[PDB]
Every structure is written in structure tokens, then in C-alpha cells.
């Protein structure tokens, strides 16, 4: 079995930024697209980005491109995304998914709640 | 950046009769390669969210087949028949053709 | 196998109130007390109250008493917490958890977001 | 209200590299009848916390060896033998002899 393991929950003041991680094992780290989605309140879930392990390239949704940032460490598998700048509506669980291919998020951490 | 909408956006359903949850893409969804990213997942009280259906009618691994979808070019529906305790929860379509991906904005099921 | 599961994730306006439902399965629900606990991100875990399943006697936190309000459904084993006047510092998961006899806290609810 | 007192409130252990929690009830804790109900819950991230020890010592089910808990009257202890990357998480001493039953402030314990 995989896993996708997260940081724990956090409280940020605002203005603040926090990092979360998501370290996963069971598959095969770099050869799979990382994707951090968030469910924030009266916005159900989006998009925010993703990163490739093996190539460390990344993408961001423009909502989020001036705050957030993505990285990820191939020694101890895992992945990162910060969110700088932060206010009341980013109150919401954070998490990762990796994407299959022929469809998308199949596996999912399991989640970080940030206030 | 497809505007996705479901609907309707609560979908209160009597344990055993089934369940059906629209969804309506604001363009074409399908990929140049021909496929078309729609999908449906399913977000349990309190779990991450899970993948239950992809390109369009295709059931995931593990998937009971209750669960089904349908529709084309700009319409999709997703399909309960027999809804049971453990479909509740709150249902999202999903876009992955066009960049950014997006999701509806959740059908919440309950008994 | 026994196991609480709780009503889904909720969003609500500043003034309202909110209802958690938990569901007992597996095992003989009146025999044991039901707490609620919630985890706000400020201060870890606390303790709101409990109540007992067979004569739906009741304790609450003294930071609850005046909001709060335990009550249960034997017909269906189902134990519900009602938090009324929410505030921003209400913003947190509460959990159900049910009580092992030596131990407080046996087999806790997946836990119920509240925003 | 008994008030738990932990120290420290962040332990980055070092792996493999023993571990030890302090708690302090403002009051002795023993119940009317002969049970101190002192006890220990870990809250791994974004998991329900779990009981890990309660009677002060006595480890839950299928909790490791390499926990175990000491103390009586006002000082407690928890302590893990080799701190593996799976034990991270918030820490809590709990004492539930007395209502309201108290928890401590936390101790967040990382790699």
C-alpha cells in the first residue's frame, strides 16, 4: 500500500505563512506528479499546484502563484508547499494527491488543517 | 478554468431508491488526445476526499458498482442507483483536460 | 469492529449554531458514556462534556454550559453535541469518543470540522 | 479544574534517540476509590488522538513497548525507548479522576 503522510494541523496568525509536508512511500516517489489541493470554505476543493518529484518542476494555479511555492526532497521522499501571506479565507485542510495518469488523484494524504 | 456545476447541491435520499447528481462544464471538456478528464470523487464525513469514477464512466479499482457515470461534451451525470449508509458524504466533479483542473462545488448526500 | 462515525465537515455563519451526529456501531451503546472532545488549533484537546446513553444524564464543561447541548438517539445509537452562538474560536474538529471502563477514551469518531 | 502542566511543549527527538515527557497535576489525582485515571493520548497529524497509556502505567492494547509511563501523586512521566519517525505527533497527558477531566497543554514531539 502507499501512503501519503502530512504534517499536523497548524494555527497561523495572519499575515503569517506555514509550510506543510507530505512524505509518501509504498510507490515509487519521483516518477509521479505531486498535486496540493485545498478545501477551504464556500469553495469546496481546488487546484492550487503541483511539482514533479523527479525534476522538481513545478506549477501554480495564478490564485495562488504570488504565495504559494512547492519543493520537494527525493532523499526522504517528500514533498512541501508553503503559503505565505496568509488570511481568514485560507482557513482550510490542506492536502496532497498524487495523479495516475489515465486519471488523476488516486491517492491522497490525509489532510492538514490550518486556521 | 471550466466553470464546473453540479447540481443540485444537496441531495437528501431515502436509504434503497437511487440518486443522481448533475454536472455541466462551462466548454467542451474533451483532450485533444481524445479523452475526456471528467471525474467524480467522493469525500466521506471526515475522510480525503477518493476517486470513484474517471473519464467520464470508467470506475475506479475497488469502486462498488452502484456508483456510474455518463454524459458528453458539456453534460455528466453521476449515478447511485440504491443509495446506502456509507454514500453520504459530498460529491464533486472534476476537469482535468484543460489547465487548471477545477472541481464542481459539491453535492452533499445524506439519508 | 467497533467504531464511531461522525456527521461531515461544517460551514457556518458567526450567530448560528451547529449539530454533531455520532453514530455507535459494533458494540452495546448504552453501556458506555459518550464525550465530546474538540481540538482547536489554540489550545489542543478539551474536554466539552459527556452524556450517558440509558438516562441521558449529562455533564458539561463550565467554557460550554451556556451553548451547549448533549443528547442521544438510542433508537438508532446515535449521540448528538449542539454548539449554539458559534464564534471564530469555535473554528476546530470535535470528536466523539466513548469511554473503555479503566480508560476515558477507548475508540474515538473520525472527528467533525467545524468552521 | 486540575490543571495538567507538560514540559516540554516541543521535543525534536532524534531518532533512535530516547524520549521522556514530564506532567504535573496541580492536585493529587487518585479517585474515590483506589484509580488514579492518569493517562496518555498521542494525536498523530491529522489523525483522532489514541490512547497510549492510562492507570499512570499500564500500556492500551496494541501499544509498543518502547512506551511506557511512570509517576505518582503530582509528577508523571512518558517516555519512549527509541523514537521512531512514526511517533511524531502532539502528546497529551490526560487526567479524567476528577471533573472536568483535564488535558495538558501538548507536547509536540518531532524528528
Known amino acids: 500500500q502507499v501512503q501519503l503522510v502530512q504534517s499536523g494541523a497548524e494555527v497561523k496568525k495572519p499575515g503569517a505563512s506555514v509550510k506543510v509536508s507530505c512524505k509518501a512511500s509504498g510507490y515509487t516517489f519521483t516518477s509521479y506528479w505531486m498535486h496540493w489541493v485545498r478545501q477551504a470554505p464556500g469553495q469546496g476543493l481546488e487546484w492550487?499546484?503541483?511539482?514533479?518529484?523527479?525534476?522538481?518542476?513545478?506549477?501554480?494555479?495564478e490564485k495562488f502563484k504570488n504565495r504559494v511555492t512547492m519543493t520537494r526532497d527525493t532523499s526522504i521522499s517528500t514533498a512541501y508547499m508553503e503559503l505565505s501571506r496568509l488570511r481568514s479565507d485560507d482557513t482550510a485542510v490542506y492536502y496532497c494527491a498524487r495523479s495516475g495518469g489515465p486519471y488523476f488523484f488516486d491517492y491522497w494524504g490525509q489532510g492538514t488543517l490550518v486556521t | 478554468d471550466i466553470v464546473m456545476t453540479q447540481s443540485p447541491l444537496s441531495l437528501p435520499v431515502t436509504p434503497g431508491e437511487p440518486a443522481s447528481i448533475s454536472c455541466?462544464?462551462?466548454?467542451?471538456?474533451?483532450?485533444?488526445?481524445?479523452?475526456?478528464?471528467?471525474?467524480?470523487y467522493l469525500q466521506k464525513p471526515g475522510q480525503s476526499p477518493q476517486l470513484?469514477?474517471?473519464?467520464?464512466?470508467?470506475?475506479?479499482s475497488g469502486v462498488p458498482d452502484r456508483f456510474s457515470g455518463s454524459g458528453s461534451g458539456t453534460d455528466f451525470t453521476l449515478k447511485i442507483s440504491r443509495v446506502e449508509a456509507e454514500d453520504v458524504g459530498v460529491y464533486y466533479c472534476f476537469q482535468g483536460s484543460h489547465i487548471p483542473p477545477t472541481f464542481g462545488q459539491g453535492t452533499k448526500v445524506e439519508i | 469492529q467497533v467504531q464511531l462515525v461522525q456527521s461531515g465537515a461544517e460551514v457556518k455563519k458567526p450567530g448560528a449554531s451547529v449539530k454533531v451526529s455520532c453514530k455507535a456501531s459494533g458494540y452495546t451503546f448504552t453501556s458506555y458514556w459518550m464525550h465530546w472532545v474538540r481540538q482547536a488549533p489554540g489550545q489542543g484537546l478539551e474536554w466539552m462534556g459527556n452524556?450517558?446513553?440509558?438516562?441521558?444524564?449529562?455533564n458539561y464543561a463550565e467554557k460550554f454550559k451556556n451553548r451547549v447541548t448533549m443528547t442521544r438517539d438510542t433508537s438508532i445509537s446515535t449521540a448528538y453535541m449542539e454548539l449554539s452562538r458559534l464564534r471564530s474560536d469555535d473554528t476546530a474538529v470535535y470528536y466523539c469518543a466513548r469511554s473503555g471502563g479503566p480508560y476515558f477514551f477507548d475508540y474515538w469518531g473520525q472527528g467533525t470540522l467545524v468552521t | 479544574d486540575i490543571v495538567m502542566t507538560q514540559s516540554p511543549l516541543s521535543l525534536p527527538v532524534t531518532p533512535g534517540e530516547p524520549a521522556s515527557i514530564s506532567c504535573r497535576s496541580s492536585?493529587?489525582?487518585?479517585?474515590?476509590?483506589?484509580?488514579?485515571?492518569l493517562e496518555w493520548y498521542l494525536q498523530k497529524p491529522g489523525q483522532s488522538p489514541q490512547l497510549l497509556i492510562y492507570?499512570?502505567?499500564d500500556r492500551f492494547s496494541g501499544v509498543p513497548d518502547r512506551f511506557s509511563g511512570s509517576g505518582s501523586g503530582t509528577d508523571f512521566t512518558l517516555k519512549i525507548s527509541r523514537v521512531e519517525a512514526e511517533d511524531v505527533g502532539v502528546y497529551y497527558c490526560f487526567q479524567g479522576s476528577h471533573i472536568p477531566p483535564t488535558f495538558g497543554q501538548g507536547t509536540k514531539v518531532e524528528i
Open positions: 492507570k499512570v502505567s
Open positions: 492536585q493529587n489525582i487518585v479517585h474515590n476509590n483506589g484509580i488514579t485515571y
Open positions: 452524556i450517558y446513553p440509558g438516562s441521558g444524564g449529562t
